[PDB]
PDB file of C-alpha atoms in Angstrom:
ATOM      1  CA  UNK A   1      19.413   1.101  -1.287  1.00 16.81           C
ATOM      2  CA  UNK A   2      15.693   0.805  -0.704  1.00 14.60           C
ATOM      3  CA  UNK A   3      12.572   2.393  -2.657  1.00 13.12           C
ATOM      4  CA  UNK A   4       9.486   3.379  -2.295  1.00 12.72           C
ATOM      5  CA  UNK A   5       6.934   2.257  -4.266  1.00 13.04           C
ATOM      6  CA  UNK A   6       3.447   3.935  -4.589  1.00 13.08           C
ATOM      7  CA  UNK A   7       1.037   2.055  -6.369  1.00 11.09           C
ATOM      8  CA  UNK A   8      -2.137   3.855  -7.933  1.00  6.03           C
ATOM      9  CA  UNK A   9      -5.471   2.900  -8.597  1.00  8.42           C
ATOM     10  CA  UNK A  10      -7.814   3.713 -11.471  1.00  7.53           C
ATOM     11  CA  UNK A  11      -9.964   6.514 -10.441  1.00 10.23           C
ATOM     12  CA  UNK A  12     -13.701   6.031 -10.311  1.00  7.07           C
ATOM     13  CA  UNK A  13     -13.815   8.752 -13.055  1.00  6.11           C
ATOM     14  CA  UNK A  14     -11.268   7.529 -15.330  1.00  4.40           C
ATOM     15  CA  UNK A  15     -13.701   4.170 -14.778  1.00  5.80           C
ATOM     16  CA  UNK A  16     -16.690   6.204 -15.791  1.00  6.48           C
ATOM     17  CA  UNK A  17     -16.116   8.941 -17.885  1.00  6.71           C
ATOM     18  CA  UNK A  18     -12.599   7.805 -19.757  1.00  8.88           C
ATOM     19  CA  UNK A  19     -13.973   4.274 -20.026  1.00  9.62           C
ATOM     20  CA  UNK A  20     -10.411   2.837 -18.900  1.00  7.92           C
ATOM     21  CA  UNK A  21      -8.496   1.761 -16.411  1.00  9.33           C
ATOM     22  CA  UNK A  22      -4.602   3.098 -15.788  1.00 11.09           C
ATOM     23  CA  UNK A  23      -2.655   1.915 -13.044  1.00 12.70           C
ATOM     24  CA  UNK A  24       0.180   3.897 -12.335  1.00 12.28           C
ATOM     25  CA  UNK A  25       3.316   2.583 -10.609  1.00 10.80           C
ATOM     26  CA  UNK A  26       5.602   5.300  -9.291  1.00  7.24           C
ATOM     27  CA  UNK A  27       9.180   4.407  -8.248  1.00  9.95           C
ATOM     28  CA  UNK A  28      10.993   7.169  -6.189  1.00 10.17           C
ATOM     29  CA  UNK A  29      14.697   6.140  -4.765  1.00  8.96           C
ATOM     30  CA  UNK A  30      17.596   8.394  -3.621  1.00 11.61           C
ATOM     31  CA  UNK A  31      19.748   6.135  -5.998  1.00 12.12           C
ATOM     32  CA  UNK A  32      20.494   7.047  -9.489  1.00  8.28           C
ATOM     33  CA  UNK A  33      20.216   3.185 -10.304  1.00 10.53           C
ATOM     34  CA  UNK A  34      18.205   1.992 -13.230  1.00 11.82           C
ATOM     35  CA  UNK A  35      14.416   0.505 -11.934  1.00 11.03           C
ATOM     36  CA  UNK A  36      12.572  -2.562 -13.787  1.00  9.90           C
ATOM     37  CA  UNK A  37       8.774  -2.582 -13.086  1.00 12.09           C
ATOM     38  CA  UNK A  38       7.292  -5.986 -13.846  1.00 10.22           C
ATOM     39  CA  UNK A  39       2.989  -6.370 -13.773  1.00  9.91           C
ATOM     40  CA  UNK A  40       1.318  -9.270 -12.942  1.00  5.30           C
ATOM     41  CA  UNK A  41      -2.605  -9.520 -13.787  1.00  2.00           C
ATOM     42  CA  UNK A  42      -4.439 -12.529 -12.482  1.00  2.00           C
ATOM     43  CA  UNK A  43      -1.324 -14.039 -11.613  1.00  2.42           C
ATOM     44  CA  UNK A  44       0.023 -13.616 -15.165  1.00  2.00           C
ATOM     45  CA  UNK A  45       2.704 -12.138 -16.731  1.00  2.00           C
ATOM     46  CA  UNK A  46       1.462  -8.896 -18.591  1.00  2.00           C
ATOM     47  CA  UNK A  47       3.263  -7.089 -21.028  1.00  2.00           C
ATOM     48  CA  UNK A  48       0.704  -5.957 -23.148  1.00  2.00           C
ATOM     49  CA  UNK A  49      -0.364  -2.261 -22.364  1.00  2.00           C
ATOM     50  CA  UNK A  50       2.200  -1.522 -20.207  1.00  2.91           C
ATOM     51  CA  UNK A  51       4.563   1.701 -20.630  1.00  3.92           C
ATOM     52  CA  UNK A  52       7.865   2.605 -18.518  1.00  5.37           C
ATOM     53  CA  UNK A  53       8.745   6.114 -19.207  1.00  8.33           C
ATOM     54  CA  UNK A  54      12.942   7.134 -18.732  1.00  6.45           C
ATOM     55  CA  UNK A  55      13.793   7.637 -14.973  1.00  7.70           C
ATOM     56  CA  UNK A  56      13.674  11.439 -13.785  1.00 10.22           C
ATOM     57  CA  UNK A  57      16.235  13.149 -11.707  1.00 11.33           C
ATOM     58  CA  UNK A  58      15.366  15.728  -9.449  1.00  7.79           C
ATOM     59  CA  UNK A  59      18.341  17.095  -7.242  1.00  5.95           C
ATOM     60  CA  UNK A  60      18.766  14.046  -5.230  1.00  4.70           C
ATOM     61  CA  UNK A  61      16.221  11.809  -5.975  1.00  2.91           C
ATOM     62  CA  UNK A  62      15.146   9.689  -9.085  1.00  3.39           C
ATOM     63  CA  UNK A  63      11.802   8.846 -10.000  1.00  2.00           C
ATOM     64  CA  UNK A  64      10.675   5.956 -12.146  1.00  2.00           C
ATOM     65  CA  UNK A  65       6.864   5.748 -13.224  1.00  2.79           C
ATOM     66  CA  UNK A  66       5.503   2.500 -15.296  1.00  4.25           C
ATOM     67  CA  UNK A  67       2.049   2.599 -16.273  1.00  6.85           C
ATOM     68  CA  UNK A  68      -0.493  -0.399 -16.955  1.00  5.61           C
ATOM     69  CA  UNK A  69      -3.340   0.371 -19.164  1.00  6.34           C
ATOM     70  CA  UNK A  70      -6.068  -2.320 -18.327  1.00  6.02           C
ATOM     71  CA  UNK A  71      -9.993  -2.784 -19.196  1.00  5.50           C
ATOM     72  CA  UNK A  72     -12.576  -1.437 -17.110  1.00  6.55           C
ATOM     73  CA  UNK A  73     -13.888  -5.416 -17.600  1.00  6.95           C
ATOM     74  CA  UNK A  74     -10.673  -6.510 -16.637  1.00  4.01           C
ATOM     75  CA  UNK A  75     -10.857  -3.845 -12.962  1.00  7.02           C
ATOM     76  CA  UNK A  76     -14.481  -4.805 -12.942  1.00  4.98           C
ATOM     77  CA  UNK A  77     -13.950  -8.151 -12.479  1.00  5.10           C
ATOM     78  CA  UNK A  78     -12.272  -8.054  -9.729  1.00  2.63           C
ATOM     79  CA  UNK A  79      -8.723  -9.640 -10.950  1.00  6.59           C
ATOM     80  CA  UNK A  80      -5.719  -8.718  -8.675  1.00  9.83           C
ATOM     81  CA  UNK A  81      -2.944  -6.515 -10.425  1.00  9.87           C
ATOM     82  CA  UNK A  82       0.817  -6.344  -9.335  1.00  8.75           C
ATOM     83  CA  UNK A  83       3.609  -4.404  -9.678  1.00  6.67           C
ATOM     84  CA  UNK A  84       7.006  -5.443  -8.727  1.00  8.35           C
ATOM     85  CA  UNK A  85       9.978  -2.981  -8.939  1.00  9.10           C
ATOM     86  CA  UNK A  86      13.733  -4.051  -8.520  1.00  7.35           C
ATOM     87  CA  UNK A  87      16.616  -1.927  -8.714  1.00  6.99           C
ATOM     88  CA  UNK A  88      19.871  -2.385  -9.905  1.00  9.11           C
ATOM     89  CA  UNK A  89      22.229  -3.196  -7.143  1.00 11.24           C
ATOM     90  CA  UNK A  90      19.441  -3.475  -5.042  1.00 11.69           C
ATOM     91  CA  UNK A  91      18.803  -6.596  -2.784  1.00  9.78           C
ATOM     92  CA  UNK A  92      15.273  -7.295  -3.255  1.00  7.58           C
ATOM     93  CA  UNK A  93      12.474  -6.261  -5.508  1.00  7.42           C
ATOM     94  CA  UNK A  94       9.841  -4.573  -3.556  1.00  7.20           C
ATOM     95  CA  UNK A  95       5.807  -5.634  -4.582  1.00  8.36           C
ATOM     96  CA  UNK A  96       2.648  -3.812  -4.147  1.00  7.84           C
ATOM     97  CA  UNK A  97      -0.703  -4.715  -5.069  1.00  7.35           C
ATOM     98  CA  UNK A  98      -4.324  -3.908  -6.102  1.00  8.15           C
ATOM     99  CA  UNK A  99      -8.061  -4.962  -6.510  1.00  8.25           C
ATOM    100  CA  UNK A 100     -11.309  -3.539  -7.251  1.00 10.16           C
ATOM    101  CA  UNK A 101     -12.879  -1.925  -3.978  1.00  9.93           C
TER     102      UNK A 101
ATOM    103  CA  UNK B   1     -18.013   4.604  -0.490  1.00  9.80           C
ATOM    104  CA  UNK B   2     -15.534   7.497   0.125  1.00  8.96           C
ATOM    105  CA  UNK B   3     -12.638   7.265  -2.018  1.00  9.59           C
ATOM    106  CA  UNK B   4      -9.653   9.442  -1.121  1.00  4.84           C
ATOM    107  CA  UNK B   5      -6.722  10.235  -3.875  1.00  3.31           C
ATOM    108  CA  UNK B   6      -3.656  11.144  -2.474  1.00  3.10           C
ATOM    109  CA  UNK B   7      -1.464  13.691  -4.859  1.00  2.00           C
ATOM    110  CA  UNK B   8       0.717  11.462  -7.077  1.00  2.00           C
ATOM    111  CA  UNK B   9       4.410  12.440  -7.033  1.00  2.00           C
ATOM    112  CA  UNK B  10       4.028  13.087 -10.528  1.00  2.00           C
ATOM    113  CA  UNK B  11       1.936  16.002 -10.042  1.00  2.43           C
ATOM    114  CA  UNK B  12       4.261  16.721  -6.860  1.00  4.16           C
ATOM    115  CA  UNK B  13       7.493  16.715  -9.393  1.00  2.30           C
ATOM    116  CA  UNK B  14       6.252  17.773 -12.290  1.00  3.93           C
ATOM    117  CA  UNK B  15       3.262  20.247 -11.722  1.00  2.19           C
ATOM    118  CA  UNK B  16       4.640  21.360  -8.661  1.00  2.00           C
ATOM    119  CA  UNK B  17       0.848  21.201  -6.734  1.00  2.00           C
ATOM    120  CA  UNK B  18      -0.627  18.656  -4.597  1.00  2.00           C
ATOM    121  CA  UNK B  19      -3.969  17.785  -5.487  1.00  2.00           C
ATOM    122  CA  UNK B  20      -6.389  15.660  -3.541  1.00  2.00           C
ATOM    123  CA  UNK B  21      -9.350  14.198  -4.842  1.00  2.00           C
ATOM    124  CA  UNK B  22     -12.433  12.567  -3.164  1.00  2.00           C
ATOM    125  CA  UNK B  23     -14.660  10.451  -5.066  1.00  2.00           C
ATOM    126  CA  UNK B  24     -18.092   9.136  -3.389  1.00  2.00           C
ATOM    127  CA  UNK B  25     -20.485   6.569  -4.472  1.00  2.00           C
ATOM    128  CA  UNK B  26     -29.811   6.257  -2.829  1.00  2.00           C
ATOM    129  CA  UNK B  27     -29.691  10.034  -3.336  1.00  2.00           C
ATOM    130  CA  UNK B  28     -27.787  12.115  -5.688  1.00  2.00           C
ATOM    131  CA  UNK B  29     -27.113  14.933  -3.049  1.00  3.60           C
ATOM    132  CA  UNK B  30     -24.025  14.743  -1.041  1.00  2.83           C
ATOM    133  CA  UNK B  31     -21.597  17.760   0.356  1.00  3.99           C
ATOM    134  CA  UNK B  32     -18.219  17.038   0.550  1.00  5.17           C
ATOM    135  CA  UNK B  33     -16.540  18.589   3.273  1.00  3.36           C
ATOM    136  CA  UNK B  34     -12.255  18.892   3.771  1.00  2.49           C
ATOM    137  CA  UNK B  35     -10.203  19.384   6.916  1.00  2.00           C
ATOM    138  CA  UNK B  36      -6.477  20.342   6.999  1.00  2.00           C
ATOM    139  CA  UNK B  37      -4.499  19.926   9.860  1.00  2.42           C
ATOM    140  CA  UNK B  38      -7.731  19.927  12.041  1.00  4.99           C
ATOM    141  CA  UNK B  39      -9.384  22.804  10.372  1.00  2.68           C
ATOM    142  CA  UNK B  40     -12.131  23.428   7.908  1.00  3.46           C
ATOM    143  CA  UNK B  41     -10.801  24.137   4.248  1.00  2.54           C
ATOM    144  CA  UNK B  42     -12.562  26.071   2.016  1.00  2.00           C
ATOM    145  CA  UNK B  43      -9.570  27.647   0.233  1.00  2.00           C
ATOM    146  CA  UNK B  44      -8.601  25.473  -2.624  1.00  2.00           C
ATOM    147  CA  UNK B  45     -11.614  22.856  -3.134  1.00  2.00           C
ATOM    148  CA  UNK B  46     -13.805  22.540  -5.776  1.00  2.00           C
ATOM    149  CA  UNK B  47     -16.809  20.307  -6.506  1.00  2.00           C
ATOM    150  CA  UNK B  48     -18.260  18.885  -9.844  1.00  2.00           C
ATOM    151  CA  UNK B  49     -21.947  18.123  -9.848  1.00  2.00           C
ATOM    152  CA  UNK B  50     -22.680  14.551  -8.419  1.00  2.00           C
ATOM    153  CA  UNK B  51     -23.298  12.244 -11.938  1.00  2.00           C
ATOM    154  CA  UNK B  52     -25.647   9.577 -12.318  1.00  2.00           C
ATOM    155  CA  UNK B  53     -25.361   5.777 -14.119  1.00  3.38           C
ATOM    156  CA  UNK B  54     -27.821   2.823 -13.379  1.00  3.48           C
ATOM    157  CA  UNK B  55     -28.530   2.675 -10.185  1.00  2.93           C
ATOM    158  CA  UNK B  56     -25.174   4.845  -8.430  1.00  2.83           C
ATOM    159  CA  UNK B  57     -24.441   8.411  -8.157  1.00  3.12           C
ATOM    160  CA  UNK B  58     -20.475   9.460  -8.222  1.00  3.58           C
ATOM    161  CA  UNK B  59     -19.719  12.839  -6.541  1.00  6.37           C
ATOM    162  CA  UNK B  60     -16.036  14.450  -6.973  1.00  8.78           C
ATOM    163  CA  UNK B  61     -14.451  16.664  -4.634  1.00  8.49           C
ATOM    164  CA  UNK B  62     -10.687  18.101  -5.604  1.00  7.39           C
ATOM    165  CA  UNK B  63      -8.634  19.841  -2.912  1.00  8.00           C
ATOM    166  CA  UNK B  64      -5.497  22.000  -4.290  1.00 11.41           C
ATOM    167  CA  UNK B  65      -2.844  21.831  -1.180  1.00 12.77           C
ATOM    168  CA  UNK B  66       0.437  22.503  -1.539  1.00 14.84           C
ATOM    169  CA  UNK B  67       3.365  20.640  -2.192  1.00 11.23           C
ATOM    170  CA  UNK B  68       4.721  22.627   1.470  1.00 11.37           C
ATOM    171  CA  UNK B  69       2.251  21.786   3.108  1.00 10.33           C
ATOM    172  CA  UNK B  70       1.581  17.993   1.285  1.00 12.65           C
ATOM    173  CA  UNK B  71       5.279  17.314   2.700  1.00 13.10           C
ATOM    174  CA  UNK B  72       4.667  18.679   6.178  1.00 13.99           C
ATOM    175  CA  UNK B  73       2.969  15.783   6.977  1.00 13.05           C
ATOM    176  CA  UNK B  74      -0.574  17.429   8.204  1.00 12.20           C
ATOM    177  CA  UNK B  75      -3.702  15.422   8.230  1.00  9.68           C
ATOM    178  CA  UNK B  76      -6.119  15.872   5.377  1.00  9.46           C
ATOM    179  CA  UNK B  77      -9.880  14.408   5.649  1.00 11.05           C
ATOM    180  CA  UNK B  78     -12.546  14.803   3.422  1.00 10.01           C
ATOM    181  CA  UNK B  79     -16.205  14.103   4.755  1.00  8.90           C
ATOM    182  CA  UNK B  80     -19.431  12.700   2.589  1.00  9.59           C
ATOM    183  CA  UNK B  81     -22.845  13.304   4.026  1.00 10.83           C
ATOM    184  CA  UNK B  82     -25.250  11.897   1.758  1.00 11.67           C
ATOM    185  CA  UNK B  83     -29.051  12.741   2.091  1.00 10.68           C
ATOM    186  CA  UNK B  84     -20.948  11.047   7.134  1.00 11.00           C
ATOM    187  CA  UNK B  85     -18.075   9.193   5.649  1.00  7.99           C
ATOM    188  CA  UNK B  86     -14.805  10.146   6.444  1.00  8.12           C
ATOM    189  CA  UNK B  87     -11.520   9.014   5.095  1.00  7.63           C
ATOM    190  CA  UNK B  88      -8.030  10.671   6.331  1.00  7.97           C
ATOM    191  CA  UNK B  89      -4.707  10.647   4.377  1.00  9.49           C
ATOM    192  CA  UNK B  90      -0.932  12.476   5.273  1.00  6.63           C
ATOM    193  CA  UNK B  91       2.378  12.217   4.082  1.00  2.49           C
ATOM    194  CA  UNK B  92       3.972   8.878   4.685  1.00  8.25           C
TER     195      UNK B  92
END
C-alpha cells in the first residue's frame, strides 16, 4: 500500500531565466488507487496555482504528478512549501517538504 | 553551491532518458566535471556558458544517462572547480 513520493525543487534556471518557480510533486505507487496531493505554503492551505494532472499507468505501476506554480518572491523568501499525498485505501498520507537553499 | 538534479520520473516515463543536471553558483569560470560508477564521463554531458546577474555567476552542466543505467543504481557525481565541490546522487 505505500508510495513514494519525490518532491522537486525549482531549478536555479527556471529561478533565473523563466522568472518562476514550479514545484513538482511526483507520486509513483504499484497501486492503481486514486492519489490526492494537498500543498501547504507558509503553513497555509494553497490552492491557487496548483495543477494535478490524471494518474498514468505504466505496466504495473501508476504515477501521479501535481504541480505548484509559486513566485520566485514567494521561493526567495524563504517560506517552507509542502506536499502531502494520500491514497485511497491507503493508511497514512505520506509528506515531504522544501525551502530555499 | 553545487546543485545536483536527479532525472524526474517524468522524463524517466515519458521521455524515456535520464537526465542529470548540475547547477553551480567570485569568478565566472568553473569546469564541471561527471563521474559514473567511479569513472570519468564525457559521453553524454554538455555545458552552457556560465551566466552572470548582480553579484553571482550560475554555471549548468546536463548529463544524458540512461534510464538502464539510472535504475542500476550506480553512483553519479558531478564536480565544480571554480577559479572542488562535489555532490553524489543514485537510485534510491
Amino acid at each position: 500500500s505505500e508510495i513514494a513520493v519525490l518532491l522537486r525543487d525549482p531549478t536555479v534556471e527556471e529561478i533565473w531565466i523563466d522568472k518562476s518557480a514550479t514545484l513538482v510533486c511526483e507520486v509513483l505507487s504499484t497501486v492503481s488507487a486514486g492519489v490526492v496531493v494537498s500543498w501547504m505554503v507558509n503553513g497555509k492551505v494553497r490552492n491557487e496555482g496548483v495543477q494535478m494532472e490524471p494518474t498514468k499507468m505504466s505496466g504495473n505501476q501508476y504515477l501521479t504528478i501535481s504541480r505548484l506554480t509559486s513566485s520566485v518572491e514567494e521561493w526567495q523568501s524563504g517560506v517552507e512549501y509542502t506536499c502531502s499525498a494520500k491514497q485511497d485505501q491507503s493508511s497514512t498520507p505520506v509528506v515531504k517538504r522544501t525551502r530555499k537553499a
